[PDB]
Amino acid sequence: MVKEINESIFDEEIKTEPVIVDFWAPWCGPCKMLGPIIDELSEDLDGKAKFTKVNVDENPGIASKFGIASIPTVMIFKDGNPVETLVGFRPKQSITASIEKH
């Protein structure tokens, strides 16, 4: 349950438990390694966190607004505010540990 989001619906999806945004591109190797992790966590942390994906090729405005200078980057939002920016590939346990903190 990872929802693909764009600038038009970004505000809606972000304000709603922590919301995780995976900034990715289909041509980026490390991003493709991260995809399955985010998918698995959307099930394992179901009821605890919400997961979404932003394709930076199609949403350059979102990427610039949040300083996504490198992909993959995973951002955590709480009450509509960005509270964590996780740059670089990380295993499942590392992402979970970060989400657990909020």
mmCIF file of all heavy atoms in Angstrom, residues 23 54 56 59-69, unseen atoms left out:
data_model
loop_
_atom_site.group_PDB
_atom_site.id
_atom_site.type_symbol
_atom_site.label_atom_id
_atom_site.label_comp_id
_atom_site.label_asym_id
_atom_site.label_seq_id
_atom_site.Cartn_x
_atom_site.Cartn_y
_atom_site.Cartn_z
ATOM 1 N N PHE A 23 11.134 9.426 -2.203
ATOM 2 C CA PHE A 23 11.521 10.125 -3.423
ATOM 3 C C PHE A 23 12.413 9.204 -4.247
ATOM 4 O O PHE A 23 13.462 8.755 -3.770
ATOM 5 C CB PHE A 23 12.243 11.431 -3.098
ATOM 6 C CG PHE A 23 11.360 12.463 -2.466
ATOM 7 C CD1 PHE A 23 11.255 12.550 -1.090
ATOM 8 C CD2 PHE A 23 10.632 13.343 -3.247
ATOM 9 C CE1 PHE A 23 10.441 13.497 -0.503
ATOM 10 C CE2 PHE A 23 9.818 14.294 -2.666
ATOM 11 C CZ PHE A 23 9.721 14.371 -1.292
ATOM 12 N N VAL A 54 7.031 9.539 -4.400
ATOM 13 C CA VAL A 54 7.095 10.675 -5.314
ATOM 14 C C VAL A 54 8.166 10.387 -6.357
ATOM 15 O O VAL A 54 9.348 10.246 -6.020
ATOM 16 C CB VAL A 54 7.396 11.994 -4.584
ATOM 17 C CG1 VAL A 54 7.714 13.095 -5.592
ATOM 18 C CG2 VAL A 54 6.224 12.402 -3.717
ATOM 19 N N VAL A 56 10.542 11.741 -8.803
ATOM 20 C CA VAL A 56 11.130 13.068 -8.938
ATOM 21 C C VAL A 56 11.229 13.510 -10.392
ATOM 22 O O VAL A 56 11.315 14.714 -10.663
ATOM 23 C CB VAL A 56 12.517 13.118 -8.267
ATOM 24 C CG1 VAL A 56 12.395 12.810 -6.783
ATOM 25 C CG2 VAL A 56 13.488 12.153 -8.940
ATOM 26 N N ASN A 59 7.868 15.197 -10.732
ATOM 27 C CA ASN A 59 7.521 16.186 -9.710
ATOM 28 C C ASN A 59 8.772 16.937 -9.278
ATOM 29 O O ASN A 59 9.161 16.916 -8.108
ATOM 30 C CB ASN A 59 6.848 15.508 -8.519
ATOM 31 C CG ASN A 59 5.614 14.736 -8.921
ATOM 32 O OD1 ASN A 59 4.554 15.317 -9.149
ATOM 33 N ND2 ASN A 59 5.747 13.420 -9.021
ATOM 34 N N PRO A 60 9.426 17.630 -10.212
ATOM 35 C CA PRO A 60 10.614 18.413 -9.832
ATOM 36 C C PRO A 60 10.314 19.507 -8.823
ATOM 37 O O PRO A 60 11.209 19.900 -8.064
ATOM 38 C CB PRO A 60 11.101 18.987 -11.171
ATOM 39 C CG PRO A 60 9.901 18.949 -12.072
ATOM 40 C CD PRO A 60 9.103 17.751 -11.646
ATOM 41 N N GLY A 61 9.079 20.012 -8.786
ATOM 42 C CA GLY A 61 8.753 21.079 -7.854
ATOM 43 C C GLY A 61 8.727 20.608 -6.414
ATOM 44 O O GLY A 61 9.186 21.316 -5.511
ATOM 45 N N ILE A 62 8.185 19.414 -6.174
ATOM 46 C CA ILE A 62 8.209 18.846 -4.831
ATOM 47 C C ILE A 62 9.647 18.603 -4.394
ATOM 48 O O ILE A 62 10.040 18.928 -3.268
ATOM 49 C CB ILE A 62 7.386 17.547 -4.777
ATOM 50 C CG1 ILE A 62 5.940 17.812 -5.191
ATOM 51 C CG2 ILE A 62 7.440 16.945 -3.380
ATOM 52 C CD1 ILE A 62 5.089 16.563 -5.254
ATOM 53 N N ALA A 63 10.453 18.022 -5.285
ATOM 54 C CA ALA A 63 11.834 17.708 -4.940
ATOM 55 C C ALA A 63 12.601 18.963 -4.540
ATOM 56 O O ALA A 63 13.341 18.955 -3.550
ATOM 57 C CB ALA A 63 12.514 17.004 -6.114
ATOM 58 N N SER A 64 12.430 20.056 -5.289
ATOM 59 C CA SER A 64 13.147 21.286 -4.970
ATOM 60 C C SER A 64 12.656 21.890 -3.660
ATOM 61 O O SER A 64 13.457 22.377 -2.854
ATOM 62 C CB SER A 64 12.999 22.295 -6.110
ATOM 63 O OG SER A 64 11.637 22.612 -6.344
ATOM 64 N N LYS A 65 11.341 21.864 -3.429
ATOM 65 C CA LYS A 65 10.785 22.464 -2.222
ATOM 66 C C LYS A 65 11.384 21.848 -0.965
ATOM 67 O O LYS A 65 11.639 22.551 0.020
ATOM 68 C CB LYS A 65 9.265 22.307 -2.217
ATOM 69 C CG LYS A 65 8.592 22.754 -0.931
ATOM 70 C CD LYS A 65 7.078 22.784 -1.088
ATOM 71 C CE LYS A 65 6.375 23.060 0.234
ATOM 72 N N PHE A 66 11.613 20.535 -0.976
ATOM 73 C CA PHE A 66 12.094 19.818 0.196
ATOM 74 C C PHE A 66 13.572 19.466 0.100
ATOM 75 O O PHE A 66 14.048 18.600 0.843
ATOM 76 C CB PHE A 66 11.252 18.562 0.411
ATOM 77 C CG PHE A 66 9.816 18.858 0.710
ATOM 78 C CD1 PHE A 66 8.831 18.611 -0.229
ATOM 79 C CD2 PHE A 66 9.453 19.403 1.928
ATOM 80 C CE1 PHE A 66 7.509 18.893 0.046
ATOM 81 C CE2 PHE A 66 8.131 19.686 2.208
ATOM 82 C CZ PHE A 66 7.160 19.432 1.266
ATOM 83 N N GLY A 67 14.304 20.125 -0.795
ATOM 84 C CA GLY A 67 15.744 19.955 -0.865
ATOM 85 C C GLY A 67 16.197 18.550 -1.182
ATOM 86 O O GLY A 67 17.260 18.129 -0.712
ATOM 87 N N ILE A 68 15.427 17.811 -1.976
ATOM 88 C CA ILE A 68 15.794 16.445 -2.337
ATOM 89 C C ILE A 68 16.913 16.503 -3.369
ATOM 90 O O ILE A 68 16.679 16.351 -4.574
ATOM 91 C CB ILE A 68 14.579 15.659 -2.856
ATOM 92 C CG1 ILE A 68 13.441 15.727 -1.832
ATOM 93 C CG2 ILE A 68 14.959 14.213 -3.132
ATOM 94 C CD1 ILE A 68 13.831 15.265 -0.441
ATOM 95 N N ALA A 69 18.139 16.727 -2.894
ATOM 96 C CA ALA A 69 19.300 16.836 -3.764
ATOM 97 C C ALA A 69 19.856 15.486 -4.186
ATOM 98 O O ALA A 69 20.641 15.423 -5.139
ATOM 99 C CB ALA A 69 20.398 17.635 -3.057
#
